[PDB]
Each structure stands twice: as structure tokens, then as C-alpha cells.
Amino acid sequence: EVVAKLCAHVFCGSDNLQIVPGVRIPQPLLQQSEEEERARLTAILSNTIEPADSLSSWLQLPRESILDYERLQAKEVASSTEQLLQEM
């Protein structure tokens, strides 16, 4: 369902998608120039700036889940070091 809700978001779209919150991708034009379209897609990749909260902003999951992931891995590290000190 995660892959389904993502693919339903990335393909269906009419002239504007806005996959990342900053950039919108328009549909290809009538001129049918493939080199011009290649240059347009490369220019659209060059203009972008990766935000700091990209892990929570570009991916639609909330940032509290990110904080939960950091808390769990921090807990695993703190527990293993505490266990190693207690063993010696």
C-alpha cells in the first residue's frame, strides 16, 4: 500500500505534479524536440535546492516519526555501551 500510494502519486498528473514541495514538473510541450526536453529536464534538476527537512518534507511521513527513529537508534547505542561498561 505504501508503494501503491506512492506510484498513484508519481504517475497520474496533468501539467503539474509537485513531487517535492518546491518544484512542479509540467507536461512536455507540442514542439516534440527531444533535445529541448532533455535540456528542460536537466535545467529543472539544476534549479532545485535540497531542504534540510528533506527526509520529512520530501517523503510524506511526518517528522515525529523521524524523531522516533532517532530515539530508537540512540536507545540501542546507549544500551549497548551501558551493557559493556557493566560487563567489565
Task: Find the structural class using helix and strand composition.
Answer: mainly alpha
* Secondary-structure element order, N to C: HHHH
Main pleated-sheet profile:
none
- How many β-strand stretches? 0
Helix coverage percent of residues? Answer: 55-70%
Instruction: Tell me, briefly, the overall form.
Output: elongated
Question: Percent of residues in beta strands?
Answer: under 5%
Report the radius of gyration as a whole number of Å.
21 Å
Number of helices: 4
Question: Termini separation (Å)?
Answer: 48 Å
Subcellular location: Cytoplasm, Cytoskeleton
Subunit structure: The dynein complex consists of at least two heavy chains and a number of intermediate and light chains. Interacts with DYN3.
Family: Belongs to the dynein heavy chain family.
Protein name: Dynein heavy chain, cytoplasmic
Features:
ATPase inhibitor, mainly alpha, motor protein, 1 chains, AAA ATPase, 88 residues, Dynein heavy chain, cytoplasmic
What would your notes on this structure say?
It is classed as motor protein. Keywords: AAA ATPase, ATPase inhibitor, Motor Protein. Yeast dynein motor domain in the presence of a pyrazolo-pyrimidinone-based compound, Model 1. By secondary structure, this protein is an all-alpha fold. It is built from 4 helices and no strands. The chain has helices at residues 2-10, 34-46, 54-57, 63-87. The termini are far apart.
